[PDB]
Amino acid sequence: LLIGVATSSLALHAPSQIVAAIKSRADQLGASVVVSMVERSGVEACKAAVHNLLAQRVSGLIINYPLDDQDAIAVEAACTNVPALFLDVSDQTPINSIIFSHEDGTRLGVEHLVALGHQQIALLAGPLSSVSARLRLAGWHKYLTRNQIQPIAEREGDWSAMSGFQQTMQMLNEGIVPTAMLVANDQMALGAMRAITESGLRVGADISVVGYDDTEDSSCYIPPLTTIKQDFRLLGQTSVDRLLQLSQGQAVKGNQLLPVSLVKRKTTL
Amino acid sequence: LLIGVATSSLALHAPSQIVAAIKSRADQLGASVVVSMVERSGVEACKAAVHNLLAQRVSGLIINYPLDDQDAIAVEAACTNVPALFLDVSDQTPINSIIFSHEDGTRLGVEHLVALGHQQIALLAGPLSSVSARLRLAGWHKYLTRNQIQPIAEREGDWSAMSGFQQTMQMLNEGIVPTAMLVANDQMALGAMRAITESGLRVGADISVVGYDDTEDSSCYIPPLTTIKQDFRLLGQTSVDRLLQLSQGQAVKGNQLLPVSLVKRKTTL
Numbered sequence: 001l002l003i004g005v006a007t008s009s010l011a012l013h014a015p016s017q018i019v020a021a022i023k024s025r026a027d028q029l030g031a032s033v034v035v036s037m038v039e040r041s042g043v044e045a046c047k048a049a050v051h052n053l054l055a056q057r058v059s060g061l062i063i064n065y066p067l068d069d070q071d072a073i074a075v076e077a078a079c080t081n082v083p084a085l086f087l088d089v090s091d092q093t094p095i096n097s098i099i100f101s102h103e104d105g106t107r108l109g110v111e112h113l114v115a116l117g118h119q120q121i122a123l124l125a126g127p128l129s130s131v132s133a134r135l136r137l138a139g140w141h142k143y144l145t146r147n148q149i150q151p152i153a154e155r156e157g158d159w160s161a162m163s164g165f166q167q168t169m170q171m172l173n174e175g176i177v178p179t180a181m182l183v184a185n186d187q188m189a190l191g192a193m194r195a196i197t198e199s200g201l202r203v204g205a206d207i208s209v210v211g212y213d214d215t216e217d218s219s220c221y222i223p224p225l226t227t228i229k230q231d232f233r234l235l236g237q238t239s240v241d242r243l244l245q246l247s248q249g250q251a252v253k254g255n256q257l258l259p260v261s262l263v264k265r266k267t268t269l
Numbered sequence: 270l271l272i273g274v275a276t277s278s279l280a281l282h283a284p285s286q287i288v289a290a291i292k293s294r295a296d297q298l299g300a301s302v303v304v305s306m307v308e309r310s311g312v313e314a315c316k317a318a319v320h321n322l323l324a325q326r327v328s329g330l331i332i333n334y335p336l337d338d339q340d341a342i343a344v345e346a347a348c349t350n351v352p353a354l355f356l357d358v359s360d361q362t363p364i365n366s367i368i369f370s371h372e373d374g375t376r377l378g379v380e381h382l383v384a385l386g387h388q389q390i391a392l393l394a395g396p397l398s399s400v401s402a403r404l405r406l407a408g409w410h411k412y413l414t415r416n417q418i419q420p421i422a423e424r425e426g427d428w429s430a431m432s433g434f435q436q437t438m439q440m441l442n443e444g445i446v447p448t449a450m451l452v453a454n455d456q457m458a459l460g461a462m463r464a465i466t467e468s469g470l471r472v473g474a475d476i477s478v479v480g481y482d483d484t485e486d487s488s489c490y491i492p493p494l495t496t497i498k499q500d501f502r503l504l505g506q507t508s509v510d511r512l513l514q515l516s517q518g519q520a521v522k523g524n525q526l527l528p529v530s531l532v533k534r535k536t537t538l
């Protein structure tokens with residue numbers, strides 16, 4: 001009944017929604033939630049957060065923070081026996097984890113653009129320090145290669161809208177104009193959509209955009225953003241229930257994958 | 270040492286940025302931060318959070334949660350002997366508080382639009398359960414009335430983009446068509462800008478928009494959003510500094526007003 005959440009920056013909209021979805025499940029169950037924010041990137045920042053949560057005697061940890069394989073294991077060891085569930089890891093890491101299907105996410109975005117007839121596709125990845133950014137990049141490569149398509153550009157942002165603006169602007173100023181972009185989050189897609197629009201092009205007709213997350217604002221971007229919905233409500237419910245199953249010792253104990261879906265809006269065409 | 274933050278929903282961009290700005294400054298000083306999220310709405314929810322935080326034995330409280338005068342006073346009494354700082358209150362309450370100048374935010378928005386020759390001004394307020402949304406509405410009224418202008422419409426959203434979209438579409442479908450709108454946050458302004466655009470009109474030239482907060486995304490809206498910037502970095506730094514001063518026994522004891530500024534971008538003309 002006291003869950004600690006260690007989270008990547010709350011300035012990013014997906015972690016804030018996840019935190020809210022966690023609380024909201026914990027509220028149903030009578031559980032309290034404490035949140036500690038991880039001080040930029042690395043296993044040492046994440047361990048720091050974990051100790052600060054254990055410093056208030058949480059009975060369970062939800063770690064929503066990107067950890068490379070060995071890092072996740074270092075972090076799991078430091079959770080010293082207190083139930084810990086990881087939310088931003090590869091499904092290959094031998095720890096308790098609930099992740100969204102990157103295979104599906106990436107397949108859907110790729111297959112959607114392929115069905116729409118795009119052949120000039122650019123990739124705007126998240127920062128490759130993030131395991132989840134890398135999984136989505138890898139997935140786009142997998143499905144594009146299956147489709148016998150190579151991206152015409154692939155860039156890397158930092159998940160923020162401005163990084164999406166800068167990367168898309170620099171891609172465009174290089175003379176590289178895809179007819180569609182697969183973007184690794186909705187915040188970066190917002191930025192890319194601004195780059196596109198300010199370059200005198202129409203989002204959708206000239207450069208379609210597929211985002212990732214369906215974070216809350218996305219239905220009201222201009223135009224509303226076609227995207228890979230990851231249900232953070234489901235993530236919150238699921239992880240809280242699982243955490244509590246763990247602290248009562250009769251839980252599933254590796255990875256679970258949650259499904260995702262494609263929300264068709266107005267930025268594809 | 271250990272800063273407990275009680276915060277309204279982190280799913281809204283401004284409380285997230287404020288929480289990130291708090292951590293930022295506390296990281297500079299060596300302090301830890303834990304965050305309790307406040308459940309739904311009202312003083313009883315906020316009091317629980319404060320008691321969650323007290324039970325973690327935090328050495329200092331930052332309450333970023335909208336509290337009308339008497340609810341604020343009730344919450345402050347609930348803080349026991351632990352230094353508490355309120356960020357979402359009016360400056361009339363005899364508690365420790367650091368708030369942005371709503372007088373200046375509203376004046377700035379109103380004067381900017383009047384200065385631009387606008388006479389048909391619609392107001393999109395935050396939810397009126399929020400003391401700060403009421404303070405902004407009140408300031409808009411004050412400065413419009415000074416200018417002997419009556420708003421041609423006034424509506425209420427819930428701080429989300431979609432509320433901004435729903436309210437502005439409802440407005441325009443009623444045949445109420447302003448030449449400018451003062452919106453109580455950037456998220457709703459995003460929705461308002463979507464509504465205006467999808468109604469066949471040009472944000473800026475047809476219907477100018479002023480948002481509120483300068484939250485991170487807004488430099489990337491389409492077109493980028495003219496807004497009342499509230500420096501959450503500043504808020505973070507000032508509130509952590511003042512909390513640790515108070516922690517000792519040597520700080521300013523009442524309200525501090527932080528300045529705000531008008532950031533002119535592309536949504537006014």
Ligand SMILES: CC(C)S[C@@H]1O[C@H](CO)[C@H](O)[C@H](O)[C@H]1O
Nearest residue numbers: 008012014015087088132159185
């Ligand atoms: C549970 C995560 C893989 S979701 C991941 O979180 C990131 C922050 O690390 C960014 O917010 C991305 O937009 C989001 O998809």
Ligand SMILES: CC(C)S[C@@H]1O[C@H](CO)[C@H](O)[C@H](O)[C@H]1O
Nearest residue numbers: 277281283284356357401454482
């Ligand atoms: C310090 C706060 C009054 S800023 C306030 O927070 C609100 C949520 O309570 C919304 O996020 C608004 O956009 C923001 O201006």
